[PDB]
Design a protein around this ligand. Structure first.
Ligand SMILES: CCCCNc1ncc2c(-c3ccc(F)cc3)nn(C[C@H]3CC[C@H](N)CC3)c2n1
Ligand SMILES: [Ca+2]
Ligand SMILES: [Ca+2]
Ligand SMILES: [Cl-]
Length: 256
């Protein structure tokens, strides 16, 4: 059960980054790794929030994919602390904004944009196969690896699917809805979803059939892919494995 638990003494906490802090983890191999330490705002006076925490934690430590963040361990003071690899390049959201500045990253071609999307599709395929729900999929939660590949992490009304807003239901298809909204952030290079539309308007807005509008120089085929993610009936939406292959093929059809 409690194999993932790491001794507090092996950990050094630094300045607050986003509460998520910077840290130095000392490993079994002698060396030290740079980490990020999310402290959970968790409910005590009831062991129910803490039991579900560890249960997911243990399941998360066994996750080993190049497009999914690695849960390096769990520490406890009685505050629970997830330990994660530190990514010097940061979240994909900020990167995208930065890209539209001189002195910041280069102008991103569509090939790299699709490639970001593909990477999230691969991470979400892996999780959907393990029956693990993300629950908070958005571009700001995708981290960039040192080799500039994207992993999903941190597992906001404008990302929630209609059924999840209306009812209390959330499945893999709700995650698929979020993925399209994420797809759209990448194609817009960091726009906020539903410009002009406010948070309390969302439910009635989506209930009338309106969805995220097509970005200007965005391919017809890519909007077709992201739109399939917002079909009213969850069972009408493609799985992450379907989506992964459509993006991989679409990207392959674009020149090198
Ligand atoms: C919580 C899962 C992610 C764990 N790894 C990780 N790695 C790096 C960072 C940096 C960061 C800060 C300044 C820089 F120049 C470069 C990077 N901030 N955060 C915390 C953010 C990550 C994005 C999220 N949306 C809010 C919390 C980082 N987390
Ligand atoms: Ca057209
Ligand atoms: Ca139907
Ligand atoms: Cl829109």
């Amino acid at each position: 059960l409690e194999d993932v638990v790491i001794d507090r003494n092996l950990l050094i906490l630094g300045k607050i980054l986003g509460s998520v802090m910077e840290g130095n983890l000392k490993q079994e191999d002698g060396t030290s790794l740079k980490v990020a330490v999310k402290t959970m705002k968790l409910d005590n006076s009831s062991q129910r929030e803490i039991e579900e925490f560890l249960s997911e934690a243990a399941c998360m430590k066994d996750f080993s994919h190049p497009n999914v963040i690695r849960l390096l361990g769990v520490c406890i003071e009685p505050k629970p602390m997830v330990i994660l690899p530190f990514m010097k390049y940061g979240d994909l959201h900020t990167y995208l904004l930065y890209s539209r500045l001189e002195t910041g990253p280069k102008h991103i071609p569509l090939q790299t944009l699709l490639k970001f999307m593909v990477d999230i599709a691969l991470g979400m395929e892996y999780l959907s196969n393990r029956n693990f729900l993300h629950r908070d999929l958005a571009a700001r939660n995708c981290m960039l690896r040192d080799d500039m590949t994207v992993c999903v992490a941190d597992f906001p009304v404008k990302w929630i699917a209609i059924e999840s807003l209306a009812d209390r239901v959330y499945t893999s298809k709700s995650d698929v809805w979020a993925f399209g909204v994420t797809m759209w952030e990448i194609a817009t290079r960091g726009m906020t979803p539903y410009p002009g539309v406010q948070n309390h308007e969302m439910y009635d807005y989506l209930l009338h059939g309106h969805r995220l509008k097509q970005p200007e120089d965005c391919l017809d085929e890519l909007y077709e892919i992201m739109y399939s993610c917002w079909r009213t009936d969850p069972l009408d939406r493609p799985t992450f494995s379907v989506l992964r292959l459509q993006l991989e093929k679409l990207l392959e059809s674009l020149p090198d």
